[PDB]
A = this chain, B = another copy of it.
Amino acid sequence: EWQEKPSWNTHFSEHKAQGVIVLWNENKQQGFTNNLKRANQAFLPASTFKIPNSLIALDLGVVKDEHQVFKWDGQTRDIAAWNRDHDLITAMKYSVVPVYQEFARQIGQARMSKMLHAFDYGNEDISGNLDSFWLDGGIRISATEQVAFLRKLYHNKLHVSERSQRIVKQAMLTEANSDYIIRAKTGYSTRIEPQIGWWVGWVELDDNVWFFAMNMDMPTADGLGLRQAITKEVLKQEKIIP
């Protein structure tokens, strides 16, 4: 079941922001959100799509392992961190779009489409450009659907090999300390309105896992840091992290 916590709206309004956070207590099989309506509203995934894209590329052997080098093609693109060699870990960390656009070209429309359906991923729709449908094409996913997808990934329940799922969860590693581990991926959809930021992932504790997915209106890139900060405010209010 889900549970609306209207009080959670404070963490968006006090930063002059609008958005939704969805939390799922894995032990209790219970979910929470500040707004049920926006929690089920579907948006472009933008770079959160790197999670399923990585999985498919690994499963098909386009990516051999997490340290295989994807050599820069020498084309100077607008983001300097993209204009160099990467592996899967740094391609995820630096959200290196051209690396993932090449994965999509190699996967191809037929296999991309069939795998998204097998994942039950959002509307499972790849309409648009093969190399950009997750930025300006027809694919859409909600915060609650991100959580459903992530829980399957966490439990190795997607129907790719276990190895492919473990490698992707490695590549999602964002923060770890003696209190918690976070595996997650940011997103920033700017190509079509509404411009939004994403953060989806989970928090591993000693004895529970808490899945999360948030999106928020992002008129300016100046607020991108709020994706993680609002999420962390909610986690601390709920005593999930100190």
Contacts and interface: CB of A to CB of B under 8 A. Distances in A.
Interface of A: 89-90, 93, 162-163, 166-167, 170, 173-178, 181, 204, 206-207
14 contacts: A89-B204, A89-B206, A90-B206, A90-B207, A166-B166, A166-B167, A166-B170, A170-B170, A173-B173, A173-B176, A173-B181, A174-B176, A176-B176, A176-B181
Contacts of A162: 163
Contacts of A175: 176-177
Contacts of A177: 175
Contacts of A163: 162-163, 166
Contacts of A178: 93
A85 to B, nearest CB: 9
A175 B93 CA distance: 16
A178 B93 CA distance: 8
